[PDB]
From TrEMBL, chain B:
It comes from the Viruses. It comes from Rotavirus A. The chain holds residues 2 to 58 of 775 of the full protein. It is found in: Virion. This is Outer capsid protein VP8*.
C-alpha cells in the first residue's frame, strides 16, 4: 500500500528518569593482521589493524 | 432585648456579601485531575549486547 497508517500497540505506562553514576575500568588490546605476498617472501601486502 | 435574634435572622442576607468578601480575599488553587490506567507497566525490549561494526578490509 502507498498510504499512511497508525495503530496503538499498548496503552500508557509509567517511566522514571534516573541518574546512574558509576566508575568504569575499560581495558583492551589492539589487533594486528599480517599477511605475506605471493613471491619469494620479501613483500608484505598488508600489515593493518 | 428579644429583638437581637429577630434582627440577626432578618439581616442574615448580608452573609452573602461577607462570603463574597472572604472569597475575594482567599487565595486559590486547582487540580489537574490525575489519570488512571497505568495497569500495564512496559519493559524496554529484548536487548542483546554485542560488539559494534568492525571495520574490516
Amino acid at each position: 500500500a502507498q498510504v499512511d497508517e497508525d495503530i496503538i500497540v499498548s496503552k500508557t505506562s509509567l517511566w522514571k528518569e534516573m541518574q546512574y553514576n558509576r566508575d568504569i575500568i575499560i581495558r583492551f588490546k589492539f589487533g594486528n593482521s599480517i599477511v605475506k605476498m605471493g613471491g619469494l617472501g620479501y613483500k608484505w601486502s598488508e600489515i593493518s589493524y | 432585648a428579644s429583638l437581637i435574634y429577630r434582627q440577626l435572622l432578618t439581616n442574615s442576607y448580608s452573609v452573602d456579601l461577607y462570603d463574597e468578601i472572604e472569597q475575594i480575599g482567599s487565595g486559590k488553587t486547582q487540580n489537574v485531575t490525575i489519570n488512571p490506567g497505568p495497569f500495564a507497566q512496559t519493559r524496554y525490549a529484548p536487548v542483546n549486547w554485542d560488539h559494534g561494526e568492525i571495520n574490516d578490509s
